[PDB]
Amino acid sequence: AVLKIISWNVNGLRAVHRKGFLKWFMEEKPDILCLQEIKAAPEQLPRKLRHVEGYRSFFTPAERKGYSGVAMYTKVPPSSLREGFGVERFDTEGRIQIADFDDFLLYNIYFPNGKMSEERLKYKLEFYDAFLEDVNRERDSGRNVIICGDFNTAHREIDLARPKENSNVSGFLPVERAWIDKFIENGYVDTFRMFNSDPGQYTWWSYRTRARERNVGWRLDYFFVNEEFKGKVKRSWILSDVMGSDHCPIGLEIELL
Amino acid sequence: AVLKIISWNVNGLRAVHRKGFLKWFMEEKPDILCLQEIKAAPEQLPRKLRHVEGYRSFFTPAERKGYSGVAMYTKVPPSSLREGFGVERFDTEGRIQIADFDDFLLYNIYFPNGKMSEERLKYKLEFYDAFLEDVNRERDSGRNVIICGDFNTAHREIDLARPKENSNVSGFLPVERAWIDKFIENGYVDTFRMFNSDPGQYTWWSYRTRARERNVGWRLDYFFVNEEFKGKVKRSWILSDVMGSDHCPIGLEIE
DNA sequence: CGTACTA
DNA sequence: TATACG
Lengths: 257, 255
Ligand SMILES: [Mg+2]
Ligand SMILES: [Mg+2]
Prior knowledge:
Two copies of one chain form a homodimer.
Chain A: E1 2-9, H1 13-18, H2 21-27, E2 32-36, H3 47-50, E3 56-60, E4 70-74, E5 80-82, H4 88-91, E6 96-100, E7 105-110, H5 118-140, E8 145-150, H6 163-166, H7 174-185, E9 188-190, H8 211-214, E10 221-226, E11 233-238, E12 250-255
Parallel strand pairs in A: 1-2, 7-8
Antiparallel strand pairs in A: 1-12, 2-4, 3-4, 5-6, 6-7, 8-10, 9-10, 11-12
The structure holds magnesium ion (2 copies).
Chain B binds a DNA duplex through loops.
Active site (chain B): 150 (proton donor/acceptor)
Cofactor (chain B): Mg(2+)
InterPro entries (chain B): AP_endonuc_1, AP_endonuclease_F1_BS, Endo/exonu/phosph_ase_sf, Endo/exonuclease/phosphatase
């Protein structure tokens, strides 16, 4: 078994759908598709999206309508699916999908964006904390984990185009980058950096300035594995030619069974 | 005393502010201003709006941020300010302001818009019902009432430009007009219709089609009084030259 | 069409 | 620059 996972902040599932999302979905082989920021409730979605031939679909919308929300399409059915950490305020924004595939638990997370206010930045860092405890608790019991999605933070100065300009901007705060440091220090690997040391490798670009054309950008989307499972990751790349969102999709291949 | 009350769906207080709301407010000099669809929380408003020289301000925002909300500016201070009917689902949308001025209670209400879904249309009609019980309970027990704001419904075919086309559109449903009938039947007067019998008199126009230029429009904003208090209403007109919103302001003068 | 929220 | 509800 050589399995394939794609992660992508679509910035509106209905939006990408109108830009031919389904056609690209067939174009690819993905054994599991993780989507962040779908901005919809299942009922609001066209039937052709709700049900894709060969896939079982799961949707976790935010309580607040048309905001946040994550989704998962899968070819192999999961054992179970958890939708929160067990903390009321964190579970209701539709940012969490934890899917048991026996071999590994798959974390599909849309991490909070801090840019908006200092009030919301607090939420982000406490989300991070809630996240670590959760992933650790499961890794502690011996389970392998794959963590994907939009972390809303570039880690190192190489992970974005304008590091010096943005050191005061949320998404590159010292307190934010310090957490990813801590996160990796807890026994988790940035799967992308295992195979690629080059700068200029980004996953998000600003719409406001037509940034993507320059390739001025940020790496905000990551695949992480616990180091114990590190041996089984064959590929970790950035599908940076796929359009339709301010993010591009990212891919992981695992060698299994 | 001759007392002047203006009611207006501003369609975003911040928005009209940027179109010079305060300058009109200054020039018109009303004794009480009632505003609907403020679309803001007090914290989000510029300080120059939050407080105005000579006026005491009250804000009732919806729980849901940047949606609905009503506001009141007043030169006379009230004995009380109730913000709901006592029904959880109706009180959490910032649609209700009831202000005691001794002589009369002032109702500043932003009635729900039904156009969006049948699910929300249910809410509207149940809002109406909650509203009647409330206004009746107060008047039955000897208080005079002034009810102003956006009712989101034209009453009669004269109250809008395209009645036949819109008989299926929410805002002119029979279920809705039947309620205003019931409402008036309960001893309340459409103060505007006391002084003006003419058609073409409207308060809302659609943005989508540049309708206001034609004067294709609907009368959705009303001043109502209980008939016992009817004698004290001197004027009830439509300030239809004041721009900045899809609604225009309406005015009442009392004694 | 236009106001607002959030990214 | 790019979902909601009037
Ligand atoms: Mg986004
Ligand atoms: Mg409006």
